[PDB]
Write a protein that binds this ligand. Structure first.
Ligand SMILES: Nc1ncnc2c1ncn2[C@@H]1O[C@H](COP(=O)(O)OP(=O)(O)O)[C@@H](O)[C@H]1O
Ligand SMILES: Nc1ncnc2c1ncn2[C@@H]1O[C@H](COP(=O)(O)OP(=O)(O)O)[C@@H](O)[C@H]1O
Lengths: 52, 371, 371, 185
């Protein structure tokens, strides 16, 4: 095994990754959904500014 | 045209078109090579052998096993296997169908990237997908919520799935699968001390795992019966050669799942892992899962697992609330069956990878695009 | 005589007399026990092990962790730890000093009642007090008003304190501490798929958390650099064994604090929690806190947190008004240091619990008498 | 099955034990197999002359050093287990991560085969192959290894704790051989 497994696994699993994760897209969407202070206070400032 | 799915859930390997009830045929993913000087000059030397062909030929062949711990060990060997499977069983050309790939969840990107890279380049194939086991398990079992346990040839799983969504934090993933258990078996077996170690010799155990195992109802009480009785003990032949007759050594084996001391680790076991992973997940859902509890494949084949599991949950659950588990007949096939369903729906036409993307962007595409 | 303070802020545990600059020594509050048959008969069997002694001995020991979520899990284990700490490090007898206790705020009475009950009964100790972290944090940081963030080993905090008073309604308390983050780390780490799960294996990560982490300045831009460069990627050894080399997986970790999706929860994060909790608190004070902003301990150790925090506040604040944060060097010690100050002032002689009360009334005394 | 190459040849049990003497006298461990073959082509100092216990002088080539290699390569009587050293590193990689350095330090060998000069060296060569070179490695090769076990047994006998630990006749009266398997390892 020390030859057989390691020849592949040491060599290739060296370089594992690159992506702009779709899971991070999920995170971004969620944080947008759950920036309460952003949505609510923007909406309230926008409306409440107009007084007639 | 038509659409084709490979199962690479480990153990024998399962492949079939969308809408057939069961895959055409199935192969272990053994790989093996010669061990001795080739001394019939009349013989053609082939240097690598796979599948039931090898399963016959085994004795002078020696095995390599191209998937450890659900991680596929050596790519070019896989490519040999894969090529063989297409041409010899399937009589299929890579252009012919979209092809669907079956993955351990939560495991290193590399398997994604090379698998796709090879199969789009080495094979040239209209559409590709890789899918996580539990999804198929639900689709086949047809309950949109659930939790799945499927401990195959390879790394052993807990996923709760709620209807229509993943809880990837919730998920637990374990290298406890039956192969390593079997290799523990030998360290049992030397007690009776009929004893042999090599790969083929190890696979011989697999038959016994088919035939001779059954699940401990209660461990202490079983020991008491072990002192009382020999009906616990059954008599079995070598595949050829001797009759062999086996005591508690049969039932002791599955307990490892409940107690992975015997080859020693800490993760508190299938059931305690499950309830742990529940208690991670949130409060209200839980009843459904108490209702909807689902199991499949290699280990589950054993008679009785579901019962002691339920005993365990009745230990850990507040008894007040309903509990049951599902134990379908077909579990070992379940995944590929679900894959067939998965293949059926037109939405993957929206969803498949196409060659074009692989042209325009790398393997990186997958990890956004798929789960 | 003289006066002695235990820190039981979780992580390594900190203890020292009033007026020393830094505690004599410090211990993880790991607890661990044997895993295997004891097979050197020459060995003395000790069945429980703690502290750097265990930290050496670990491998056959297996860990229990006596504080979850800042809540101390198993009392008698604590008692073992506590006894050890006194006698082995401190060479101290319970009579010798008043003793001061360090508490997560806003958490269940039970910790108060049993802690006091044990320590007055099991130890017999002139005077007792339990104090809330933020108070010490101010005293050490020496600004009578403030808000504190200190996310230790254990449950993670927001308290505004105004000068001389509490706003217990204002306060936010979160189980987001670095341990759970670290356990998420593994679910990261299997991407590169060098992979190991057990308690000691988990603590091995702690070193990497020391060495390899740094705070994302900007997430998108960092991803762009991640596509560009490998300087983002650094090479690190196993504590023994291999060299390991780590990409974005380092910086991605702290973002969880800003986005606890990655192990998924909703509380909108440290900073948004903070501004929320501000907007709870009243209007005029706010400028001071915009000025006086204070952070400490386990997570804060990371380089850069304060900067992105300020970026976040500049997002959320009306830019018009001054903003800054404090990031002292010594934050991880800060609490016990403040405790030393707290010990110094004679007013606790007015304030300590005495044995007499514990005689004349129960643990109930505390909850009136202390905060 | 080697020896018939030179084809002075005898098979029975006593004849087989006669070899044991040669195993005492004539063996030594291959430092490097290829390089040894090159020397085998070059030289006869590799070849030494030895008597029958009575009767003839016998003189033996590579047939001496080839023998121990079986330990490293059990082809020559053919099996798969990847050998002493690869078994060892395998069994390590089973065992957990932190301990390993100690074992890299503490490496111990004894008895019948180990008697051969040189084993420890090529073993270390092998581990330096398989180890990450970064970390210390050594092995212990005490003089007395073949006796070691009984010596240790003497120590084992010494300590009073076995008085706590021995089996006594009484148990054997009151319960079977079964006693052992709980009671002892
Ligand atoms: N008749 C049987 N009884 C019990 N176990 C079996 C039987 N046949 C196969 N198995 C085990 O089931 C597994 C078959 O592989 P599989 O379950 O498909 O793994 P994977 O989940 O990786 O696809 C192997 O562990 C094999 O030893
Ligand atoms: N060098 C370091 N770099 C970053 N974090 C660290 C370092 N050393 C320890 N930590 C973390 O800091 C915490 C130490 O416990 P502590 O901050 O005292 O918690 P508590 O607030 O409960 O007292 C743990 O989360 C530990 O993992």
């Amino acid at each position: 095994x020390x030859x057989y497994x390691x020849x592949x696994x040491x060599x290739x699993x060296x370089x594992x990754x690159x992506x702009x994760x779709x899971x991070x897209x999920x995170x971004x969407x969620x944080x947008x959904x759950x920036x309460x202070x952003x949505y609510x206070x923007x909406x309230x400032x926008x409306x409440x500014x107009x007084x007639x | 045209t038509t659409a084709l799915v490979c199962d690479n859930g480990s153990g024998l390997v399962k492949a079939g078109f969308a809408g057939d009830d069961a895959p055409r045929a199935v192969f272990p993913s053994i790989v093996g090579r010669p061990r001795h000087q080739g001394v019939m000059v009349g013989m053609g030397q082939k240097d690598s052998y796979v599948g039931d062909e090898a399963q016959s030929k085994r004795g002078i062949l020696t095995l390599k096993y191209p998937i450890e711990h659900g991680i596929i060990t050596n790519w070019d060997d896989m490519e040999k296997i894969w090529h063989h499977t297409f041409y010899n069983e399937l009589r299929v050309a890579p252009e012919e169908h979209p092809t669907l790939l079956t993955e351990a969840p939560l495991n290193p990107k590399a398997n994604r990237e090379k698998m796709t890279q090879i199969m789009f380049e080495t094979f040239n194939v209209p559409a590709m997908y890789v899918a996580i086991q539990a999804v198929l398990s639900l689709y086949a079992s047809g309950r949109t919520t659930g939790i799945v346990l499927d401990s195959g040839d390879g790394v052993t799983h807990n996923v709760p799935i709620y209807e229509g969504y993943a809880l990837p934090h919730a998920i637990m993933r374990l290298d406890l699968a039956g192969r390593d258990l079997t290799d523990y078996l030998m360290k049992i077996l030397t007690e009776r001390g009929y004893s042999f170690v090599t790969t083929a010799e190890r696979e011989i155990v697999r038959d016994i795992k088919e035939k001779l195992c059954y699940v401990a109802l209660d461990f202490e009480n079983e020991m008491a019966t072990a002192a009382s009785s020999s009906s616990l003990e059954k008599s079995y032949e070598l595949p050829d050669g001797q009759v062999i007759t086996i005591g508690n050594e049969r039932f002791r084996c599955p307990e490892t799942l409940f107690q992975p001391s015997f080859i020693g680790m800490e993760s508190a076991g299938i059931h305690e892992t499950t309830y742990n992973s529940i208690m991670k997940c949130d409060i209200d859902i839980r009843k459904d899962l108490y209702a909807n509890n689902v199991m499949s494949g290699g280990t589950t084949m054993y008679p009785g697992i579901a019962d002691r599991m339920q005993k365990e949950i009745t230990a850990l659950a507040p008894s007040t609330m309903k509990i049951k588990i599902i134990a379908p007949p077909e579990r070992k096939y379940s995944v590929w069956i679900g894959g067939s369903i998965l293949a059926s729906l037109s939405t993957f036409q929206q969803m498949w990878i196409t060659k074009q993307e692989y042209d325009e962007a790398g393997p990186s595409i997958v990890h956004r695009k798929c789960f």
